[PDB]
Structure formats: structure tokens, C-alpha cells
Symmetry: C2
Subunit: 225 residues, 2 copies
Amino acid sequence: MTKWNYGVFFLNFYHVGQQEPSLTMSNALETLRIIDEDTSIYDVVAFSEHHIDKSETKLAPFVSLGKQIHILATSPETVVKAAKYGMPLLFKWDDSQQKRIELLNHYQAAAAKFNVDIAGVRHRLMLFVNVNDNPTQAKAELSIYLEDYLSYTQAETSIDEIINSNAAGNFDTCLHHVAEMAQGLNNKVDFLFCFESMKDQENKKSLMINFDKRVINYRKEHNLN
Amino acid sequence: MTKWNYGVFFLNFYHVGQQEPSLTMSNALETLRIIDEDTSIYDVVAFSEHHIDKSETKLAPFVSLGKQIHILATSPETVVKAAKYGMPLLFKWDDSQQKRIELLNHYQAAAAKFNVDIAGVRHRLMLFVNVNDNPTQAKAELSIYLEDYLSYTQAETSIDEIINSNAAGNFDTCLHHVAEMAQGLNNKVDFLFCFESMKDQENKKSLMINFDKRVINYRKEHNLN
């Protein structure tokens, strides 16, 4: 079997959740502290900043995760290019799951044609994660968090789809849904989670630690280290 | 004494050196291969893409190097903000060395005021590196490489300054100049090198390997591991 890797991302947008940018900033810095001090599984950090270019002269939509260069899966066109060079993809949190699957299949078809071996290649899937004992409250909090971003990207009507393709609900449902989406992507995805839509910093911390512990135990149980 | 760290960056711009983007791409992929297969010191990879925003809604000019978040040193204003949060800087290759020094000093002054300890903090300095037995040829190659980028950023007249604040010349002069610029920045900088202005892929490889070997030997000689 295969070890799944987990990392964290932050949405690089100044207006989220009706928060002052200074609060959004201190919240993000606590996430970083939790990564540094309280946990071990969160291997890499990235920033979601594709709302800018979308809003051309780039060599490619490159995203560096450590020293492994991914291509952000921005279009069928873009993933064909990534496959030509055998590079792993980064799937957008703001794409529907069906769309990500479509892009994965475009990619694997392109690699075959170009005789590019992609056997070992593992992609990364960006997901927002909001855990609440009341699932409606989790989805509500994520919706409110994303309001200004979606207004800026002119994608307000895609909010329900975004909610459905990310992880918002109680803890067990979120984990199950994460596993379902991985399964949909042929279990070829590692993850980047964004926890910032959880206002309650103690809840965020508890989540990040609980998940850290679950992953450590899983890896021990299955001898993945 | 302190271990200096080295990484690599690529300029995310489609028109360099009058090269077809496919060639620029295959050149970059060979650099990645050299990092992966022929050397060990190149710890992280980043992309220079600040020609875009410059050409606002970001929470900050964040750059992730692994899981260590840097702030791109885009203005005195921006570095004061980085110091408030005690975060390390990424110095621009396209800034003059005097400018980088000014920004370093702005930063250290801000941290003192805010009682933020920055003792352990190490920044990163982006530099183009072009080594040629004929120093004029190295500077010439770098100039031609950057022509279209500088036209796009409307900074054509800054080319001489850029040459002077990066490493272009014979191998020993480049290394000495890198050391001088570090010294100017109080020896508080690790590095990201961009090797892509060297057209000759064999010369690039030889350089990357020779430098790798020099750093390994240095670390052994001084017990830095």
C-alpha cells in the first residue's frame, strides 16, 4: 500500500470571513505554529493565489512544493502540457470534484500517447476543511468565509458546488469524504488542507492535532515508515 | 559558525534569451534533473513571479520555501510588516544590493521596536548565476537573457545595476561576489540561485556540480552537519 502525504495551504486573499486582515494573518500564523510545534504530518505549505492571473506571460502555472514542481490543473489544455513533461498536478479546491476527475483522465491519456511513464507520479489535491459537530454550521462558516473571494472571482453561484467538493461537516464525515474524493481520483492524490475557515482557533488546533494523531497511528498500524 | 543553505529558482516568464518556451522549459527540467540526480545541496525550489502583481488583494507577498513562509521584500513598507510577525525575507534578484541592504536594516529596526526577536532568523537572497571563463561573455549572456523580461517590467535601464547585483563572471569571482553580498547582508542570508541564463547545458551542469562539491567539502572541513 501507499503512504498518503498531507500539507497545508492558505488562500492568499485579504478579505475572508469578514475578518480584518490582521486577524486573518494572526489566525494563519497560529496554523503555522501548530504545524511547527504541535504536530508532525504537515509536510509542505502552499498558497492559493490563482485568483490573480485568472483575473499568460508565465512559463507555466508552476507551484513548488518543497523542491517538487507541480503544475496547477487550470485547464484540460494545461494538464496535457504537464503530462508531456511527466509532472504532477495540483488540483484546485475551487474546482468541482467531477472536474478534477476529468482533468486527471485528460492527464493520464496524454502521458500514454507521449510514452511518458507516470506510474510513480502522485498529485496533490487542495481542500478546505471545516469540522463542526453541526454539519450545517460547518458549511455555513465556510460559505461566509468565501463570500468576498467568490464575489471577486465572479463565481458566487458556484458556492454550493465548492462546498460539496470540499470537506465541511462533522469530523468522521469529512474524513470519509476526503477518502471518497481520493478514491475518485484513483488514490493518486496527496493533500493540502486549508483550515482557515474555522474561526475558533481552539477547534482548529484540536482538529489539526486529532488528524495528526490519526495519521500517525494509521502509518504505524500499516507499517508505512 | 553557521551553515549556509542553497536552493534554486526559476524566472516564471515565457520569453527569455530569445528561446522558444519549449526550450526554456526543457532547460529548466534539466536543472531539476541535476538537482534530483547529480547533486544534494539544492534544498528548495521557488519561482520568481513578482512581475505579475507589480504589473493588492493578496494577504501578503508570501513565498513558501518548503514549509517556511518568507515575505518577498517588495518595499520598506512590506518588510516592516514582515518584522512585526518575525518572518524571514526573500530578497529580490532584481533589486540592487544597496536596496536589499536598506530593506534588511528597515526590517531589523522594526523587529526591535516591536520587541520581536529575530536573532535566529535567516533570510533568502535570490541571485542569477552565470559563470563563464570570459566574464564579459557571462554578463552579455545574462543581459540578453533578461532583455524581454526587462522590457515587460519597464525596467530596461536597470540592466547594468542588475548585472552588478547578481553573479556573472568567472567561477571564482562569482563565488567571491556571492560572499561579498552575503557579508553586506550581515551574513544573514541563505540563497536561491537561478542558473537558466546559461544556454550551454553542459556548462550549467558542470557549474551546479562543482558548486555542490565545494559546499559539501566546506561543510565537511568545518563540521557543519
